[PDB]
Paper text:
Artemis (SNM1C/DCLRE1C) is an endonuclease that plays a key role in development of B- and T-lymphocytes and in dsDNA break repair by non-homologous end-joining (NHEJ). Artemis is phosphorylated by DNA-PKcs and acts to open DNA hairpin intermediates generated during V(D)J and class-switch recombination.
We crystallized three forms of truncated Artemis (aa 1–361) with substitutions in several of these metal ion co-ordinating residues, i.e. D37A, H33A, and the Omenn Syndrome patient mutation H35D. The overall architecture of the three variants is almost identical to WT Artemis. The D37A structure crystallizes with only one nickel ion (M1); Both the H33A and H35D variants exhibited loss of the M1 ion. By contrast, all three variants retained the Zn ion in the zinc finger-like motif of the β-CASP domain. Histidines 33 and 35 are the first two histidine residues in the HxHxDH motif (M1 binding) in the active site. In H33A and H35D variants, both β-strand E and α-helix E shifted upward and away from the zinc finger like motif. Differential scanning fluorimetry (DSF) analyses showed that both H33A and H35D variants are substantially destabilized with ΔTm around -13°C compared to WT Artemis. Our D37A, H33A, and H35D variants lost the ability to digest DNA substrate in vitro, in accord with results with full-length variants.
Residue numbers in the entry: 3 to 343, 346 to 361
The structure:
Amino acid sequence: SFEGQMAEYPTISIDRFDRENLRARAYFLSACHKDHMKGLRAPTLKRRLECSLKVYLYCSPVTKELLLTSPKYRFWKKRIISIEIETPTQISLVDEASGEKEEIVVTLLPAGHCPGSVMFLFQGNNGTVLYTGDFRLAQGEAARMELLHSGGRVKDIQSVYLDTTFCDPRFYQIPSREECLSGVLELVRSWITRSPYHVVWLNCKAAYGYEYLFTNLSEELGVQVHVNKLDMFRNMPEILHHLTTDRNTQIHACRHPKAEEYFQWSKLPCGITSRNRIPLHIISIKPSTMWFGERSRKTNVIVRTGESSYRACFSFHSSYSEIKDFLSYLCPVNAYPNVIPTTMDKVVEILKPLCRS
Ligand SMILES: [Zn+2]
């Protein structure tokens, strides 16, 4: 529910390109999650870019590379500027009419394992603010980010605009990335090593975001992962070489036409059912967030749902305990939820005790 503008710097728009964001002096994109790209190729945005020539879109190098592979975003090509990771970079913001000059320093920080995903730290003459985008970091990772600190202590951060997808005490703990990855790996390994005819379908609905899962499975098991499309990774060999559009592989992450219901699926999306007329022996594995209360113990990241079907713990977002740790550490004046699980009322109030206001 973040609508693009932070109170401290209203002339910049982040992860939202419609409505009030049509008057931005600069744009920012944290990652190629579809829900962060609302309005990014709307005719009204194109209309506005034609009549405001010094407006740029800023993002990570990987995000820029991903965007410029898509024909529908190539109208941006002249005006997308990447900023290197953890490299504080001064940007000038131009008032097209009145000529007001505005200078801000932006630093891109890692946000988690989605390709090109970043947090944006903004430092200007109205305080320091952090926009996380979607994020989940390792233990101590924020503490190790030198550019979040000054003189040994955390920077004085006025406001944090953060991913509160699981900002409720019921989502207290989520198994770690390492636990999730190891679980899926060992499940896949135990299946595909039985014979060349044993195959896995990874049921991942989004077109973007699961690439670190595919690359790790591919690296560890020596198999390319089937995908619908890999041209976005044309210039990214470390991702590209773990993927394939050829369906003759033991690991598939191909996707059904988005229109189809889950209950209508009867086979791998790409339609391969046999090799040498030997039927393929298929299990389905669906990445799915699993969580545990404060007083509970974590259980197996793999949940069996049928003879040939499984769910596997996976999260793009921090648990409630991880959110608390992050905000306790940053100790901002304000914390604003980007996502409502409830209302901005339970969640803003849940975060209040971690802030200085
Ligand atoms: Zn396939």
